Design a protein around this ligand. Structure first.
Ligand SMILES: Nc1ncnc2c1ncn2[C@@H]1O[C@H](COP(=O)(O)OP(=O)(O)OP(=O)(O)O)[C@@H](O)[C@H]1O
Ligand SMILES: [Mg+2]
Lengths: 479, 179, 59, 53, 502
């Protein structure tokens, strides 16, 4: 119920002067009552970052300060940025403020939640290491995901990263009772619009019957001020933990990407005048990242698993922005431009993708023994590509005639059709469980399937579907 | 504005307001401004080298002849203890702006080529209390010849808001004929 | 393009002559107005200026 | 090379035409400043009715 | 040229219908002037970003609205601004007059003409700091922007509505990539804006001389802030250029804009910010330099059919320092921009001109920019220059290899001769399909590398004259049809017969 006055506007940074008793505490939302270009009222939302002393706070605006005047009245809300949560958020694109920017009306909700929040307690955690079942054969074998862990995508565009994300949204909604939240931290508006229309096209956002949709999009754009961009990840996360805590679901969170969350905090801190840390980042980088990443956890109610894209500055993995990110990560999925040129979809690199979960005390010995044989077979074939270009297959040893034929069969059987590409290619997608993945690569490596052709494993789901495509080709070749 | 000079002056006004000596304190503060104008008097208080103990004794004698308010004598003693006597002049000037705020009064500045009459001043005060919301209005006059015939008033919280018709006709007609 | 330049210099000649003529007019009017009686002009002027002031404050 | 030389000579001719036209119009504005003086008196006399109500 | 007859009315014309209205203005007094900054006491009601006007006529923008003063950055030299002098806020926030009649006018950063050719007739105004279109106002990039270079328009394709970055070190050909793109759209109906921030004035005059000869100024605005100008004018010059390009884009017209170095704009906003006492970061830049360029480049994209499908294709140019792509201003714009066009001086000195490093250069739109005729043919150019990129170590050892490898070394050395264009010789899309069809389908393996340049120039002028039915297949259908693949091969075997005789 408090009215403040703007004391100064320096960039996106405001100083607001309050009465001596009634006073906001840090992270509360300030609503600046401003005027527009023409003369109508339009309000600017902010967030208290510093208490400067002498009843004066320092705020960083969530929108443009262009046209704000020293001495306009500012409403203290008494709470941080509250953002609508629920099933009213599914299929909608949101602002930082929880405002729908997709021009489909207002959000007809009755529930909000503050975006600044403590972690779940030490009691409330789910200590059980569960593997997360994605339904994708490269991931579920070679780079498994925690249920409740943080995953990294090392991929650009032209690698099918947008198709790989939509498959994870569709698999968590079908196989489990899950939802997803995509958070666009500092996203381009061209690729932000490209992602929303391909989600409409792939049926993942249901444009006709919304709230039957699978995603909630939260987009912070690049032309937003740096305060908003710092906040979008949290706003996305607050929607993701409504489905975790209240609906007891298993959520995917997506931060694209987590580096732009870092550089937006580096920009705000430089605007707030903080003496910077090593290599130019904010001195609070270890805790600004830790505030976002410790809310992403598996509780006893549900879990939120975040698959977050990671940009490596200067191709330096020891840089403080990946080094603080990689500490919280639990698996890395390297997407490959070279594997997409061969035609393999999903174009996940099998040899450079890692996990902390591929340990035999976690995934079991039958899965750990087979994922090492697949990696050793694919690493031996990566070595032999210069020898096949010099000798050819007939001059290699008989032990190594097989590890080319098997590894060429593994590279095909790692590929998979997706449900989100049924309009694009026509071939129906396949959800492949972890049970049928291990039984698939046991047959290829034990050598039972050395009679089948190579192009019977390409874009098939199960290992039974492999022999079905092969027996079709023996019936198609004879005709 | 919120600077150290302003900060101190605001405190001095607040204590007067509490004790209902706003008229009584204001007279004393105006009385102080005459005292600290003198280069020799101001220099003695301001410089670090003269011993602080000597400064208090001289200050006490000055207070007695002056007959300042009990808080006002304290306020200077507080400034001297806390080293901010180098900015007394800024503080004293700052108090006047604060004192108008507390009363709810406003100040205005009206200027002319030749001296003018009291009814004009009262009607300008009427108009300034209208457009400003003075609880009460206040007025000042400065005779300047280099205009043509008009009057310029100057008001606001700072000396900011300005309306006039003397030479703004002529400069406006230059800038309107370039159109 | 040269005829474009000549038309621009017609514009510039007109503009500088107009402004120099007007500054001559201004300083002549200023000399005459400062030659005028102070009491007669000002009383009407202050009264009308202050009336326009109060009128625009009503407006 | 022949038509480039023709271009350059024509360009000189149009340059001298330019200088003649500009010097002429500067002499013209010298003439209308040296003349046109009742305009000056009436233009002073007209604005004196506008500075005062 | 008659004046003095109608001067005796025009003085009485401005006095007629003159309002003389008394309205409240916000006045201030000048505290201090220095380095193009004015700290101002008062202006209690000024809004952030507002133009204020001084005595002696200098205009400045109130940027720091601080608690004691207002930090005003001057749009000119503040040499005649006196301590204690008045200053009044004008009421408006940084407009330009905007019009159709800017096409051909070299204007400066307030869109006043500097070409000495008269005023510009304008009736509407655009805001300089205008917001970008949102997400629902846009459409996917699907139309090509033909730059006229084979190395770009085949392998790094720029579409309409795309922000692409031309980047490299100094004297690599960044301006020539941008200038030849403007020179290519003489037939396309795009409107080009060439913004030149912080350049030498002699090189702005050479670009407009290059543009006026080749008829490029009939569809071009040149926005120019020479390095003599204050840093406010250099900071606002691409925002002035982007406001002019948003005028045509909202009037359903497609536009290209080039910023001649965004690097010098960032240095010109670092200058004002360090003089406004704002706390710096990496390379003394403020935190807003990303938010400077992201607020600029996101205004340039492709609109939806509900708005009329105007586009604004931004080609920002950024200069790096000794190839330091990880420097602070290259790191920002590579994140903001879709594609990057990397220009290297080790290819510029070797003869590969335009010096596009096509391996490192990327385009996030991808093949959605290209037409269907170009997708077919440049699918083979990308693979076969990637096979030559893996075999660059083997070019010294071409003899000691099998024929499957040695033909790839022989093919890739002619595919790089396709990419070589002289300066200001852009190719039409039909001429680009001929050149890549000939090279990627074995019809140049018989030639020495000295002759691959001479052969294609004679084959491009052959089909232009002798076989004009090829150009109508590609202009209208925009697909490399089986008819035109037959018609092109008849031109090759007749040109190879005439070129071998010579
Ligand atoms: N395709 C080309 N073939 C031959 N020369 C070229 C080509 N492109 C550019 N040049 C020449 O290279 C020189 C540098 O080109 P340009 O002026 O475009 O450089 P730049 O990248 O703008 O560098 P700077 O920003 O330092 O001026 C120019 O003299 C130009 O004539
Ligand atoms: Mg250049």
């Amino acid at each position: 119920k408090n009215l403040g006055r703007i004391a100064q506007i320096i960039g996106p940074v405001l100083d607001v002067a309050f009465p001596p008793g009634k006073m906001p505490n840090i992270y509360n939302a300030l609503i600046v009552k401003g005027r527009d270009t023409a003369g109508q009222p339009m309000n600017v939302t902010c967030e208290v970052q510093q208490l400067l002393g002498n009843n004066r706070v320092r705020a960083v605006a969530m929108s443009a300060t262009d046209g704000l005047t020293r001495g306009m009245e500012v409403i203290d809300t008494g709470a941080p940025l509250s953002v609508p949560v629920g099933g009213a958020t599914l299929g909608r694109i949101f602002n930082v403020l929880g405002e729908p920017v997709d021009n489909l009306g207002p959000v007809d909700t009755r529930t909000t939640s503050p975006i600044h929040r403590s972690a779940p307690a030490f009691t409330q955690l789910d200590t059980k290491l569960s593997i997360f079942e994605t339904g994708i054969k490269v991931v579920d074998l070679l780079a498994p995901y925690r249920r409740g862990g943080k995953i990294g995508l090392f991929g650009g565009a032209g690698v099918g990263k947008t198709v790989l994300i939509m498959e994870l949204i569709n698999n968590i909604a079908k196989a489990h009772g899950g939802v997803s939240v995509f958070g666009g931290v500092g996203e381009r508006t061209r690729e932000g619009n490209d992602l929303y229309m391909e989600m409409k096209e792939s049926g993942v956002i249901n444009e006709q019957n919304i709230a039957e949709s699978k995603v909630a999009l939260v987009y912070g754009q690049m032309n937003e001020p740096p305060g908003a961009r710092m906040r979008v990840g949290l706003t996305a996360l607050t929607m993701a933990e409504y489905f975790r805590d209240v609906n007891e679901q298993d959520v995917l969170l997506f931060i694209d990407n987590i580096f732009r969350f870092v550089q937006a905090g580096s920009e705000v801190s430089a605007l707030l005048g903080r003496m910077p840390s090593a290599v130019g980042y904010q001195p609070t980088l270890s805790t600004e990242m830790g505030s976002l990443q410790e809310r992403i956890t598996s509780t006893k109610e549900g879990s939120i698993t975040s698959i977050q894209a990671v940009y490596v500055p200067a191709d330096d993995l020891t840089d403080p922005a990946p080094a603080t990110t990689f500490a919280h990560l639990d698996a890395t999925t390297v997407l490959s431009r070279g594997l997409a040129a061969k035609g393999i979809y999903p174009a996940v690199d099998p040899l450079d993708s890692t996990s902390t979960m591929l340990q035999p005390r976690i995934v079991g010995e039958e899965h750990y023994e087979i994922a090492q044989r697949v990696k050793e077979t694919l690493q031996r074939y990566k070595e032999l590509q210069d020898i096949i270009a010099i000798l050819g297959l007939d001059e290699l040893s008989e032990e190594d005639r097989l590890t080319v034929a098997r590894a060429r069969k593994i590279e095909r059987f790692l590929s998979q059709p997706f449900f989100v590409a049924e309009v694009f290619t026509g071939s129906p997608g396949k959800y492949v469980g972890l049970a049928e993945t291990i039984r698939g690569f046991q047959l290829i490596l034990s050598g039972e399937l050395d009679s089948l052709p190579e192009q019977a494993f390409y874009l098939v789901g199960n290992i039974d579907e492999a022999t079905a495509k092969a027996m079709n080709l023996e019936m198609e070749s004879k005709l | 504005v919120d600077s150290t000079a302003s900060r101190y002056a605001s405190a001095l006004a607040d204590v007067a307001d509490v004790t209902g000596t706003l008229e009584a304190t204001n007279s004393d503060v105006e009385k102080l401004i005459r005292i600290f104008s003198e280069e020799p008097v101001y220099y003695f208080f301001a410089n670090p080298v003269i011993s602080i103990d000597n400064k208090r004794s001289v200050l006490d004698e000055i207070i007695t002849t002056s007959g300042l308010q009990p808080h006002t004598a304290n306020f200077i003693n507080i400034l001297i203890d806390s080293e901010r006597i180098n900015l007394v002049k800024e503080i004293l000037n700052e108090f006047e702006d604060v004192f108008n705020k507390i009363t709810g009064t406003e100040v205005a500045v009206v200027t002319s080529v030749v001296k003018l009459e009291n009814d004009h001043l009262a009607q300008i005060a009427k108009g300034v209390q209208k457009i400003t919301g003075a609880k009460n209005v206040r007025i000042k006059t400065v005779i300047d010849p280099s205009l043509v015939a008009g009057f310029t008033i100057r008001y606001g919280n700072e000396g900011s808001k300005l309306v006039d018709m003397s030479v703004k006709k002529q400069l406006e007609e230059i800038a309107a004929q370039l159109e | 393009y040269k005829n474009e330049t000549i038309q621009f210099e017609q514009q510039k000649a007109i503009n500088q002559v107009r402004q120099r003529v007007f500054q001559q007019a201004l300083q002549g009017a200023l000399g005459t107005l400062n030659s005028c009686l102070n009491n007669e002009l000002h009383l009407r002027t202050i009264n009308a200026n202050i009336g326009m002031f109060g009128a625009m404050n009503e407006i | 090379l022949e038509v480039e030389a023709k271009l350059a000579e024509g360009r000189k001719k149009i340059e001298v035409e330019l200088q003649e036209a500009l010097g002429s119009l500067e002499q013209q504005k010298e003439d209308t400043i040296k003349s046109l003086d009742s305009q000056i008196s009436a233009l002073s006399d007209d604005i004196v009715k506008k500075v005062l109500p | 040229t008659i004046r003095a007859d109608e001067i005796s009315k025009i003085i009485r014309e401005r006095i007629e219908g003159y309002n003389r209205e008394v309205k409240v203005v916000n006045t201030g007094t000048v505290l201090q002037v220095g380095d193009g900054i004015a700290r101002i006491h008062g202006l209690d009601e000024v809004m952030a970003g507002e133009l204020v006007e001084f005595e002696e006529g200098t205009i400045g923008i109130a940027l720091n609205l601080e608690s004691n003063n207002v930090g005003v950055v001057l749009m000119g030299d503040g040499l005649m601004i006196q301590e204690g002098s008045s200053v009044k806020a004008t009421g408006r926030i940084a407009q330009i007059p905007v019009s159709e009649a800017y096409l051909g006018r070299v204007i400066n950063a307030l869109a006043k003409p500097i070409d000495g050719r008269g005023e510009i007739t304008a009736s509407e105004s655009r805001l300089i700091e205008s917001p970008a279109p949102g997400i629902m106002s846009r459409r996917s990039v699907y139309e090509p922007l033909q730059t006229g270079l084979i190395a770009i328009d085949a392998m790094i394709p720029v579409g309409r509505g795309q922000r692409e970055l031309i980047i490299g070190d100094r004297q690599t050909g960044k301006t020539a990539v941008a200038t030849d793109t403007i020179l290519n759209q003489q037939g396309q109906n795009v409107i080009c804006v060439y913004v030149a921030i912080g350049q030498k004035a002699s090189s702005v005059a050479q670009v407009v001389t290059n543009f006026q000869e080749r008829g490029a100024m009939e569809y071009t605005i040149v926005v120019a802030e020479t390095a003599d100008s204050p840093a406010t004018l250099q900071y606002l010059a691409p925002y002035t250029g982007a406001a002019l390009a948003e005028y045509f884009m909202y009037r359903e017209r497609h536009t290209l804009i080039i910023y001649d170095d965004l690097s010098k704009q960032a240095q010109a906003y670092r200058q004002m910010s360090l003089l406004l006492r704002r706390p710096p970061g990496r390379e003394a830049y403020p935190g807003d330099v990303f938010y400077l360029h992201s607020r600029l480049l996101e205004r340039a994209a492709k609109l939806s059919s509900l708005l009329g499908e105007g586009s604004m294709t931004a080609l920002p140019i950024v200069e790096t320092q000794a190839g330091d792509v990880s420097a602070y201003i290259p790191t920002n714009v590579i994140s903001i921009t879709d594609g990057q066009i990397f220009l290297s001086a080790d290819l510029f000195n070797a003869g590969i001109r335009p010096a596009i490093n096509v391996g490192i250069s990327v385009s996030r739109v991808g093949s959605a920019a290209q037409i269907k005729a170009m997708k077919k043919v440049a699918g083979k150019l990308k693979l076969e220059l990637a096979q030559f990129a893996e075999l660059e170590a083997f070019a010294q050892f071409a003899s000691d290899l099998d024929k499957a490898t040695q033909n790839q070394l022989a093919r890739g050395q002619r595919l790089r001769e396709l990419l070589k264009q002289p300066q200001s010789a852009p190719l039409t899309v039909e001429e680009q399909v001929m050149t890549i069809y000939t090279g990627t389908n074995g019809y140049l393996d018989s030639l020495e590398l000295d002759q691959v340049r001479k052969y294609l120039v004679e084959l491009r002028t052959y089909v232009k004259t002798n076989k004009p039915e090829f150009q109508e297949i590609i202009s209208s259908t925009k697909t490399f049809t089986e008819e035109a693949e037959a018609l092109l091969k008849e031109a090759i075997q007749e040109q190879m017969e005439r070129f071998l005789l010579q």
